Design a protein around this ligand. Structure first.
Ligand SMILES: Nc1ncnc2c1ncn2[C@@H]1O[C@H](COP(=O)(O)OP(=O)(O)OP(=O)(O)O)[C@@H](O)[C@H]1O
Ligand SMILES: Nc1ncnc2c1ncn2[C@@H]1O[C@H](COP(=O)(O)OP(=O)(O)OP(=O)(O)O)[C@@H](O)[C@H]1O
Ligand SMILES: [Mg+2]
Length: 291
C-alpha cells in the first residue's frame, strides 16, 4: 500500500522513428529507462534526469504515455512515462546499464520483455510524437481571497507558493518551455517569474485570461489561447482556477482528446501536446509539492 514513485520515457530519434531500449546486468532485463523520484522532484524532472543518467542523452519531454504499477517489497512501484525526443548525447556502457539499442518500434516491441513496457510503446505510436507544447499553469498558493468583490489584483504568492514557483522551473524546462505568458494578476506573474529569470525572458501580460475577463467574454479568452498556441515555441500560460477547467474542457471536447488525469490545483500544469496545430494530448500534472 506504500507507493514508490518513479518516472521514465520512450526516448526516440529521427513509424520512421527509432526508440531506445536498455539492458541492465543486475536484472538481465531489456526495458525502457526509468527511475525513482528524488526528494523534491516531480515525475517529468525525474524522467528527464533518468534518461540522461541511464542513456547519456538530453531530451525534451512531450506527451505522457500512461502509468505502470507493479508490486515490490516496499509496496507498489508506480511509473509514469513520457515521449522524449533526443536532443543528443552518447551512451557509454557501465555496470548499471551495459547496452543501449536504438530500434524501430516493431523490433523494440519484440526486445522489450515487460508486457507493461510494450503497452507504453503501443501508446507512443498511437499518436504523433513530434509535438509542440503549450503549458497551462494554475498560479501557486497566494493566501485566501478577501471579503471584497471579485478578485484581488495584487495579492501575492505566499511562502508555499513562492517555493512552488521555484519548483516549477525544472518541471517546465523539462518540456522545452521557451516563451512566457501570465494573466493580468500579480500571483500569476510571480508563479512564472523564477522561470522568467532562468530563461532571461519577459512575461507577456494577458488581460483577456483573468477570471473577470473569462466570465465577461469567454470567446475572446479561447481565441487568445489559440493565438498564443499558434506562435512558434512552447508557451507557458499562467492563469486562474475559474479559467483553466473551461479552456481545457473546451479544447479537449473539440479535438476529441481524453485526459487520463484531472485536476485544477494551485501550482498544477496542463501539458497540451499539438501536432500541426491539432491537440493530441492533455496531461494534468499535480503541483510540484503534491502527490
Ligand atoms: N515493468 C515491469 N513490470 C513488472 N516487473 C518489473 C517491471 N520493471 C521491472 N520489474 C522488476 O521489478 C524488480 C525491480 O525492478 P526496478 O526496475 O523497479 O528496480 P530498480 O533497480 O529500483 O530500478 P529503477 O531505479 O530503474 O526504478 C526487478 O526484478 C524487475 O525485473
Ligand atoms: N471573495 C470571493 N469572490 C469570488 N470567488 C471567491 C472568493 N473567495 C474565494 N472564491 C473562490 O474560491 C477559489 C479559490 O479562492 P482562493 O482565495 O483560495 O484562491 P485564489 O488565489 O483567488 O485562486 P484563483 O486566482 O485560481 O481564483 C477562487 O478561484 C474562487 O472560485
Ligand atoms: Mg532505473
Amino acid at each position: 500500500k506504500h507507493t514508490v514513485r518513479a518516472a521514465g520515457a520512450v526516448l526516440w530519434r529521427d513509424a520512421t522513428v527509432e526508440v531506445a531500449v536498455i539492458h541492465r546486468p543486475r536484472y538481465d532485463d531489456w526495458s525502457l529507462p526509468k527511475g525513482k523520484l528524488d526528494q523534491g522532484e516531480t515525475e517529468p524532472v525525474a524522467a528527464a534526469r533518468e534518461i540522461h543518467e541511464e542513456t547519456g542523452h538530453t531530451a525534451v519531454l512531450g506527451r505522457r504515455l500512461g502509468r505502470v504499477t507493479y508490486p515490490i517489497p516496499q509496496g507498489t512501484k508506480r511509473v509514469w512515462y513520457w515521449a522524449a525526443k533526443s536532443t543528443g548525447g552518447d551512451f557509454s556502457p557501465n555496470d548499471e546499464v551495459d547496452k543501449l539499442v536504438w530500434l524501430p518500434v516493431d523490433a523494440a516491441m519484440d526486445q522489450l520483455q515487460y508486457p507493461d513496457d510494450r503497452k507504453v510503446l503501443r501508446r507512443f505510436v498511437k499518436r504523433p510524437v513530434d509535438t509542440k507544447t503549450v503549458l497551462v499553469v494554475r498560479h501557486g498558493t497566494a493566501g485566501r481571497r478577501s471579503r471584497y468583490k471579485g478578485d484581488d489584483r495584487k495579492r501575492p504568492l505566499d511562502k508555499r507558493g513562492r517555493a512552488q514557483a521555484e519548483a516549477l522551473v525544472a518541471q517546465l524546462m523539462a518540456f522545452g518551455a521557451t516563451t512566457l505568458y501570465a494573466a493580468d494578476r500579480v500571483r500569476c506573474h510571480q508563479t512564472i517569474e523564477p522561470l522568467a529569470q532562468e530563461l532571461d525572458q519577459l512575461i507577456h501580460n494577458e488581460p483577456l485570461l483573468t477570471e473577470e475577463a473569462y466570465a465577461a467574454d469567454h470567446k475572446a479568452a479561447r481565441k487568445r489561447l489559440l493565438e498564443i498556441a499558434g506562435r512558434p515555441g512552447n508557451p507557458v500560460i499562467c492563469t486562474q482556477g475559474k479559467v483553466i477547467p473551461g479552456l481545457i474542457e473546451w479544447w479537449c471536447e473539440r479535438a476529441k482528446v481524453r485526459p487520463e488525469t484531472t485536476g485544477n490545483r494551485k501550482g498544477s500544469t496542463w501539458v497540451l501536446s499539438l501536432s500541426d496545430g491539432e491537440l493530441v494530448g492533455a496531461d494534468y500534472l499535480s503541483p510540484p509539492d503534491e502527490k
